[PDB]
Amino acid sequence: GMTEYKLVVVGADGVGKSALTIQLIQNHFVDEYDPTIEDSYRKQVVIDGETCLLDILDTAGQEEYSAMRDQYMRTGEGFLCVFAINNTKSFEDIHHYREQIKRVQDSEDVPMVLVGNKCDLPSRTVDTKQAQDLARSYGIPFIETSAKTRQGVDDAFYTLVREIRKHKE
Ligand SMILES: Nc1nc2c(ncn2[C@@H]2O[C@H](COP(=O)(O)OP(=O)(O)O)[C@@H](O)[C@H]2O)c(=O)[nH]1
Numbered sequence: 001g002m003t004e005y006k007l008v009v010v011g012a013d014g015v016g017k018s019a020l021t022i023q024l025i026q027n028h029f030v031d032e033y034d035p036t037i038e039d040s041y042r043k044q045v046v047i048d049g050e051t052c053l054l055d056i057l058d059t060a061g062q063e064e065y066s067a068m069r070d071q072y073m074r075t076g077e078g079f080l081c082v083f084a085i086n087n088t089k090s091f092e093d094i095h096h097y098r099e100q101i102k103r104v105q106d107s108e109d110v111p112m113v114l115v116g117n118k119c120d121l122p123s124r125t126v127d128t129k130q131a132q133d134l135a136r137s138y139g140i141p142f143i144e145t146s147a148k149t150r151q152g153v154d155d156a157f158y159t160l161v162r163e164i165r166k167h168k169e
């Protein structure tokens with residue numbers, strides 16, 4: 001059976017969680033995707049010559065009960081922690097998402113990547129140094145992305161898979 005990597009995209013409303021997932025899946029930028037919709041996506045990819053499947057939950061932070069949400073948070077192998085480089089509050093919110101992950105996983109060693117999205121925008125209020133400093137503090141990679149231009153999108157998901165492989169070895 002083809003190895004599957006169960007991945008979970010988390011972060012504040014409006015950082016580009018849906019746009020990043022749809023760019024990876026459909027290879028286009030969606031300007032408009034209902035902020036309250038949480039759905040999973042499955043995509044076959046080749047990472048360093050290994051054919052594998054990514055099983056991705058795009059989270060929406062809604063209150064309504066979802067058996068699927070609970071399952072992915074509990075059994076997810078890797079987390080993308082997304083903020084927007086032009087949204088200081090979304091960067092300030094990252095510590096909350098990391099705490100939620102450690103608690104549901106009951107582990108201090110969960111594979112994670114810090115994702116700074118919307119790097120196409122000039123109005124940057126979160127600099128590369130402060131993002132690299134937070135990622136260093138957590139012992140995780142930092143990747144700059146644009147869902148709009150596709151800059152760093154494969155790099156973000158593929159780096160998370162490389163972190164999961166390391167954790168499995
Ligand atoms: N300029 C730019 N806009 C983005 C990017 N990613 C998402 N957006 C826009 O930011 C808004 C929120 O995106 P969305 O994917 O709904 O965020 P979510 O709430 O995290 O799922 C939408 O208007 C998107 O079109 C990006 O990389 N660059």
Ligand SMILES: [Mg+2]
Nearest residue numbers: 017018034035
């Ligand atoms: Mg969304």
